């Protein structure tokens, strides 16, 4: 602050990284194959089913159910930018189109509604800030009831 001597840092992110993933992270866009119609998340260049390069963006279903859930409460494993909210409710969310997303559940107003099979919907939230100072935004989920 008072002494502006540059501090060592191996890695600094270019804006290019997040720029290319705005579809995936703001809009839950994966990929669909034009030849066989198989769907994937996250986005990709080659269809895994048939190895076609004719692949297009696909808007994943933004509603789903909690497939599996696990609290993260261990201070030892608190990542920088995620230390303030404890517990965090980590979940695998099964979307209505069949895909599964690794995320977390937030804004739980009634704890008795937080259970396996509970319906959820996607929301845009602030995530850990980028190493180039830009705010990071991406998906999380809330209970939808």
């Amino acid at each position: 602050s008072m002494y502006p001597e540059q501090i060592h840092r191996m890695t600094t992110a270019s804006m290019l990284r997040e720029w290319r993933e705005h579809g995936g992270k703001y809009r839950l866009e994966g990929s669909q194959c034009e030849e066989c119609n198989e769907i994937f998340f996250p986005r990709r260049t080659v269809c895994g089913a048939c190895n076609s390069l004719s692949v297009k963006p696909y808007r994943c279903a933004r509603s789903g159910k909690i497939e599996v859930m696990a609290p993260a409460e261990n201070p030892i494993l608190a990542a920088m930018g995620y230390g303030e909210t404890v517990p965090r409710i980590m979940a695998m969310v099964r979307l209505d189109d069949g895909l599964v997303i690794a995320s977390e559940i937030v804004d739980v107003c009634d704890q008795q509604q937080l259970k396996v099979g509970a319906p959820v919907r996607m929301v845009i939230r602030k995530h850990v800030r980028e190493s180039n100072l830009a705010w990071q935004y991406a998906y999380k989920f809330v209970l939808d009831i």
Binding site: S14, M15, H22, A134
Partner: protein
């Protein structure tokens, strides 16, 4: 009766800093690159008693001096280096101008396209019949918000331009516009940060994904709407952070040098942000002829682009009769050294609490 620009004005700091003065200290870029390729030999230095409001009210008052007794119906201030982050500096300028309180009023922010965005807002207010006229200002102190030792320091400048929109004695009819935008963090300034920051290394890679993409998209959008092509325009005006930028964008979009040249002013000024496309337009209108066609395409990092098409009218000849051109205004200058520039722009790391001026 067609709607458009009636009068204009500009405000530019008089202090100047030769590029070599910065390069001698930091040795962080080539003198030949900045002077010859980028086209900037010196840049504007902000004095301690100057800012976006001081420049803005100067430009605005110069536009309103062309229309004696004008009552202000709307006033929009386009800037990305606002003196206030809450409350509208536009209301301060309105108060200073002393020509009415009953006005649509706000500050407008989208980086270097803030001024053109304000202009579009004013056009919409007049064309809708919500007002009879409207005053748009584009102004930035890029110098003040560029860090010592930044690669862009040697060509960061400042400036203001004001355009009055109306339907009486119109000198340039506003024909149509097209805007585009996206999330492209090529430059940012997070809430709190004084200094504007780059999102990646400088060069043609960064230019291709922001500056060129959005400028092309807006220009092609507008031309498609009007069924025109570059050959149909007497003048083209782009963002002028650097003298090289309009020529580069012109080459990229199929315009030629003679269409660009009359908008070039920034060789002795540097980057004036929100003011730069409006200052290019002013520099054109100072010498343009009735019937001529202008395409204006700005660029805001973040990112987006505003494209506007204009037609010059018969009234331009009367307006030009007793007019001080921008070219003449830019002859007024005072040279300062690097140390003095840093003092004037408040870029020394001094004590947070001052006991006297010097203790």
């Amino acid at each position: 009766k067609k709607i458009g620009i009636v009068s204009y004005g500009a405000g530019i700091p008089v202090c100047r800093l030769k590029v070599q003065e910065v390069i001698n200290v930091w040795k962080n870029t080539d003198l030949k690159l900045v002077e010859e390729n980028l086209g900037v030999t010196e840049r504007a230095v902000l004095q301690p008693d100057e800012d976006v409001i001081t420049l803005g009210v100067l430009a605005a008052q110069r536009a309103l001096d062309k229309v004696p007794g004008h009552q202000i119906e709307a006033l929009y201030l386009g800037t990305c280096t606002n003196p206030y982050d809450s409350r509208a500096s536009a209301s301060i300028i309105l108060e200073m101008l002393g020509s009415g309180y009953d006005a649509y009023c706000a500050d407008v922010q989208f980086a270097g396209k803030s001024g053109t965005s304000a202009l579009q807002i004013c056009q919409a207010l007049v064309a809708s019949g919500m007002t009879g006229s409207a005053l748009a200002i584009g102004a930035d102190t890029i110098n003040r918000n560029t860090a010592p030792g930044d690669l862009t320091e040697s060509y960061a400048g400042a400036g203001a331009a004001a355009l009055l929109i109306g339907s009486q004695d119109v000198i340039a009819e506003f024909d149509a516009s097209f805007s585009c935008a996206a999330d492209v963090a090529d430059n940012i300034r997070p809430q709190g940060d004084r200094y504007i920051r780059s999102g990646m290394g400088l060069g043609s890679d960064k230019n291709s994904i922001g500056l060129e993409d959005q400028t092309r998209r807006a220009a092609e959008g507008l031309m498609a709407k009007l069924h025109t092509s570059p050959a149909d325009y007497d003048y083209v005006v782009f963002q002028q952070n650097l003298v090289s930028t309009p020529y580069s964008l012109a080459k990229h979009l199929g315009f030629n040098p003679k269409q660009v040249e009359p908008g070039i002013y920034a060789g002795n000024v540097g980057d004036a942000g929100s003011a730069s496309p409006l200052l290019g337009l002013i520099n054109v209108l100072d010498q343009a002829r009735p019937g001529q066609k202008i395409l204006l395409v700005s660029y805001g990092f973040g990112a987006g682009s505003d494209a506007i098409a204009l037609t010059v009218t018969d009234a331009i000849e009367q307006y030009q009769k007793h007019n001080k051109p921008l070219r003449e205004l830019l002859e007024s200058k005072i040279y300062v050294d690097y140390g003095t520039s840093i003092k004037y722009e408040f870029k020394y790391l001094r004590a947070d609490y001052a006991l006297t001026a010097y203790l």
